[PDB]
Design a binder for this molecule. Sequence first.
Ligand SMILES: CCn1nc2c(C(F)(F)F)cccc2c1-c1ccc(O)cc1O
Lengths: 235, 10
Amino acid sequence: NSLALSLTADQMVSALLDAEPPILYSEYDPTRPFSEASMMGLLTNLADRELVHMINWAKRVPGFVDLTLHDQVHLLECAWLEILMIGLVWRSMEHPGKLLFAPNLLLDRNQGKCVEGMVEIFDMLLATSSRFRMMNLQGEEFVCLKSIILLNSGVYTFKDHIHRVLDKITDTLIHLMAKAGLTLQQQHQRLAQLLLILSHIRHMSNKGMEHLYSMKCKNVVPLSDLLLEMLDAHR
Amino acid sequence: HKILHRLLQD
Ligand SMILES: CCn1nc2c(C(F)(F)F)cccc2c1-c1ccc(O)cc1O
């Protein structure tokens, strides 16, 4: 029996909160990137170091440790980019029109233009960020969404355990909304709005994955073995 | 033998 299902809503929240990975910095070089090499280099470098934290974060997500190593591997390989992206969007909320990859790295669509097929993804990321902002997404909600992506994205490509743990997180989201004074109707409407954004997050992940693949074939920007293997799992 | 296999252990 998994411990996750025995946790209370409040016991689910401060665990996800406490499990949060830190906000990493990019190179301290003050040169605004415009080339693909410089931009993607900074992005992949940051992604590399974030992946290490994401891995130790996932292990802190209730119910995740109760999975087989193989399942844990499959879920991370499937959701890693979705997880990186939703984190990017969350950090970018307070910076309209900007993408805060790192406190010392904010990019706009003008810099995405200098990389074919990148601007479209930026616009999608910016739109998602904007959406998060207008909904006044709360940190407690964000952490719940991120965990849902981890357990959901690869749940099929494989049982009740994950479904039960996902239900548990659903209870926690409603809990947060009720605790925030939302009406019963406002609760299920916001729940729906939040979950529907995951569809768009998945979309951006799949588009980003394709772009990262072609980039791998051009073999200009160096990719870490970890990124390659994570990226590899998507074929 | 994935790097991910190793990192998930430690
Ligand atoms: C390297 C991961 N990555 N890839 C991104 C792309 C892609 F795939 F099209 F190249 C577009 C936008 C962001 C991308 C990221 C990424 C996302 C979040 C983050 O914190 C770091 C990143 O490199």
